[PDB]
């Protein structure tokens, strides 16, 4: 599940830089939040996982962990648990990269808007910045959609070989 968590994180951050849910910056956790991009890329990731037959692999590995770890009570290790907990870093680390391919340009766009506000005071931002940045984010990440699939396979491979290495 960690991989889908990472994809959801990247999608939610792209959406938040869209300005889609501005009420979280003023009222954190105020029952008003819609990470619709996060849901879009979450279901796209689920479709990709279905395509790459990840669930069959999961079932096969569930079977295989017997040979490594038999039903009979066997002694257990420690830092191994940390590994799964340390996998919590991946959700953030991989999420940053997916965003990076778009947030950076969005950042530049916001920087550009700043240059416009360095001119005649007020009369900018909250009136011209939001629609422009929304449309730019939309078309940018619409073009960025073909990019997730190699990253999707990368995420699945990372989770799978981490599982294989640490379960043992």
């Amino acid at each position: 599940q960690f991989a889908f968590a990472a994809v959801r994180t990247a999608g939610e951050f792209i959406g938040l830089q869209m300005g889609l849910s501005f009420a979280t910056f003023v009222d954190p956790g105020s029952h008003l939040n819609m990470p619709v991009l996060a849901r879009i890329m979450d279901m796209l990731a689920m479709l990709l996982f279905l395509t790459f037959n990840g669930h069959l692999w999961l079932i096969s590995l569930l079977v295989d962990t017997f040979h490594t770890l038999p039903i009979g009570s066997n002694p257990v290790n420690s830092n191994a648990f940390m590994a799964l907990a340390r996998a919590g870093g991946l959700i953030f680390l991989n999420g940053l990269m997916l965003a990076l391919p778009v947030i950076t340009l969005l950042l530049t766009l916001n920087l550009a808007l700043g240059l416009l506000n360095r001119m005649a005071p007020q009369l900018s931002i909250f009136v011209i910045g939001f629609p422009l940045t929304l449309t730019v984010g939309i078309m940018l990440m619409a073009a960025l959609m073909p990019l997730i699939a190699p990253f999707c396979e990368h995420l699945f491979s990372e989770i799978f070989n981490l599982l294989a290495d640490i379960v043992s």
Partner: protein
């Protein structure tokens, strides 16, 4: 053949597993998963009440499994009822059309995986696959197909919410919830494009294709 008491006992016992046959060997799973996903999509978790959707799914399954049931009746139930085929052979004769229907809709990858997990020998043709391999392969294929159908179903209902939120945000109304605005529009869409006829026909084709 078995004594009449044994035959009656076996018949009564086998009458118990009807929900299991409906859920794990029939077209019911894909339809019910698609209906649940669609209900999750429109934003009304209690709209068509579970009983209405269950009845519609039962009627759809009855209309879809009609040729398989007909073949079972003509090949197994008719000779058994006319005392031409014993009780212990009618089951074997009737399990073959259902097996064929389950096979066509299954997937190679699942079949290969469950042929490997059983440590069985090579299966050069589909005629060597037993039921112990086809059952979970068919179940997994049905689950994956249902989830694929539901996840491509989900996309337009999230697209509408995305555009609604963006339009609301253009004008600075940042404190307006987008879901409350999007729900009537999602209902309007599902009304306009024959929401149910297209879905019904698509599911029925999805079986016969």
């Amino acid at each position: 053949s078995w004594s009449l008491s044994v035959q009656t006992l076996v018949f009564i016992t086998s009458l118990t597993f009807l929900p299991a046959i409906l859920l794990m060997m029939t077209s019911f799973t894909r339809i019910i998963i698609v209906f649940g996903l669609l209900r999750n999509a429109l934003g009304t978790p209690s709209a068509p009440p579970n009983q209405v959707l269950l009845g519609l799914a039962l009627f759809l399954t009855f209309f879809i499994m009609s040729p398989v049931i007909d073949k079972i009746y003509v090949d197994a139930y008719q000779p058994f009822s006319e005392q031409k085929i014993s009780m212990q052979e009618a089951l074997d004769k009737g399990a073959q059309p259902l097996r064929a229907f389950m096979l066509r809709q299954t997937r190679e990858a699942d079949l290969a995986l469950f042929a490997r997990l059983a440590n069985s020998g090579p299966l050069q043709g589909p005629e060597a696959v037993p039921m112990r391999i086809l059952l979970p392969a068919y179940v997994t294929s049905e689950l994956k197909t249902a989830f694929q159908i539901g996840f491509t179903i989900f996309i337009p209902f999230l697209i509408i919410d995305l555009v609604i939120a963006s339009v609301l945000m253009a004008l600075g109304m940042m404190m307006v919830p987008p879901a409350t605005i999007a729900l009537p529009f999602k209902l309007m869409l599902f009304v306009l494009v024959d929401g149910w006829q297209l879905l019904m026909g698509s599911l029925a084709q999805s079986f016969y294709s």
